[PDB]
């Protein structure tokens, strides 16, 4: 499939909750909060009204990367955009399509791989909040953008993936030939380098090449640092066939200390070449 034009206006509830293990999360539902928070997909031109209810005991906020929002939706202590504890506040994210300005210049669309995260917990930059798991993927499609069969989010949050314990995964699961979207986010103090076995992508907006004239580098290794966001797609097993395809931070310490996961690509039999 390809994505349609936007303009639709969505109403979402987002709850800021303490998880059973004392972590923090966004969720569409009271008690259902996940780390990472839920995926939010918009099409260019869409508008999202998110009413945030903060159940914590500390002021918490909602900040987004790359979408259009006014100073009142900033999510910051600075701009008085945060949510006092047991409070609720509606955030408004806006999105626009590429086009020409009055002078003739080209205006860049909102489309890309983005993320939302808390800006007020533990410090005025959300250091406490980010550490404890308040973050999530935001994806903005452009009219005509190829769409996946699945999206998977991997956040390198300091030394952990998705605030999972070391050597935890996650593993993701696909069958040969599915189109698989990967959204990569990074947080904390450290730089990483993201690697995937048996697959490669294009370093550009969509991780997909236009046609024969796209100069973009093809790479299976991309260095990243806190709050970077990118994504790409893959045809699973393309040319490499089924199996367990490792993905990991390539900083050698981080890898040995367990920032690793598995991309389990299955034969159409739903069978996988025998692994460890």
Phi, psi angles (nearest 5°) of residue 131: -55, -40
Q: Which of 7, 31, 144, 169 binds Cl ion (CB under 5 A)?
A: 144
Residues that contact a second copy, how many (by CB under 8 A): 95
CA distance linking residue 199 with residue 62, whole number of Å:
34
Yes or no: say if 141 and 45 are a contact pair by the CB < 8 Å rule: no
User: Is residue 150 involved in binding Cl ion (CB under 5 A)?
Assistant: no
Query: Kind of pairing, strands 40-43 and 135-141?
Result: parallel
Residue 192 marked ligand-binding: yes
Nearest alpha-carbon partner for 6 in 114, 69, 97, 116: 97
Task: Pick the piece of the chain touching a second copy (CB under 8 A) from 11-19, 21-29, 39-47, 185-193.
Answer: 185-193
Q: Which tokens sit at 83? A: 């949510």
Considering the complex, what minimum distance in angstroms separates the CB of residue 242 from Cl ion? 7
Q: Which tokens sit at 10? A: 């969505």
Convert residues 27-66 into a mask of x (bound to a second copy by CB under 8 A) and - (unbound): --------------------------------------xx
User: Is residue 273 involved in binding Cl ion (CB under 5 A)?
Assistant: yes
CA distance linking residue 114 with residue 68, whole number of Å:
12
Q: Restricting to residues 119-178, which ones interact with a second copy according to CB under 8 A? A: 123-127, 130-131, 146
Q: Which does 50 bind (CB under 5 to 8 A by kind): a second copy, Cu ion, Cl ion, none?
A: none
List all residues 6 or more positions away from 234 whose beta carbon is below 8 Å from its beta carbon. Answer: 179, 180, 182, 199, 201
User: Is residue 23 involved in binding a second copy (CB under 8 A)?
Assistant: no
Considering the complex, what minimum distance in angstroms separates the CB of residue 271 from a second copy? 11
Q: Which does 38 bind (CB under 5 to 8 A by kind): Cl ion, a second copy, Cu ion, none?
A: Cl ion
Q: 219 forms bridges with which residues in the sheet?
A: 201
User: Is residue 275 involved in binding Cl ion (CB under 5 A)?
Assistant: yes
| Residues of the binding site for Cu(2+) | 65, 117, 119, 192, 197, 248-250, 254
């Amino acid at each position: 499939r390809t994505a349609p034009a936007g303009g639709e206006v969505r109403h979402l509830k987002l709850y800021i909750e303490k998880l059973a293990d004392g972590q923090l999360g966004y969720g569409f539902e009271k008690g259902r909060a996940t780390i990472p928070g839920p995926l939010i997909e918009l099409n260019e031109g869409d508008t999202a009204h998110i009413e945030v209810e903060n159940t914590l005991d500390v002021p918490a906020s909602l900040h987004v990367h790359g979408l259009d929002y006014e100073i009142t939706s900033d999510g910051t202590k600075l701009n008085r955009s945060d949510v006092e504890p047991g409070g609720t506040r509606t955030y408004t994210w806006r999105t626009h399509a590429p086009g020409r300005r009055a002078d003739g210049t080209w205006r860049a669309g909102s489309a890309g791989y983005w993320h939302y995260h808390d800006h007020v917990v533990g410090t005025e930059h959300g250091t406490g909040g980010i550490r404890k798991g308040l973050y999530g993927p935001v994806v903005v499609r452009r009219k005509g953008d190829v769409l996946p069969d699945a999206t998977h989010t991997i956040v390198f949050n300091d030394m952990l993936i998705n605030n999972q314990p070391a050597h935890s995964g996650p593993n993701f699961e696909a069958t040969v030939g599915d189109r698989v979207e990967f959204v990569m986010i990074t947080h904390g103090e450290y730089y990483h380098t993201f690697h995937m076995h048996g697959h490669r992508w294009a370093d550009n907006r969509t991780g997909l090449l236009t046609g024969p004239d796209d100069p973009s580098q093809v790479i299976d290794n991309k260095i990243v640092g806190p709050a970077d966001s990118f994504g790409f797609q893959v045809i699973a097993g393309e040319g490499v066939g089924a199996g367990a395809w490792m993905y990991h931070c390539h900083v050698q310490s981080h890898s040995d200390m367990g920032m690793v996961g598995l991309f389990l690509v299955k034969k159409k039999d739903g069978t996988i070449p025998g692994h460890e």
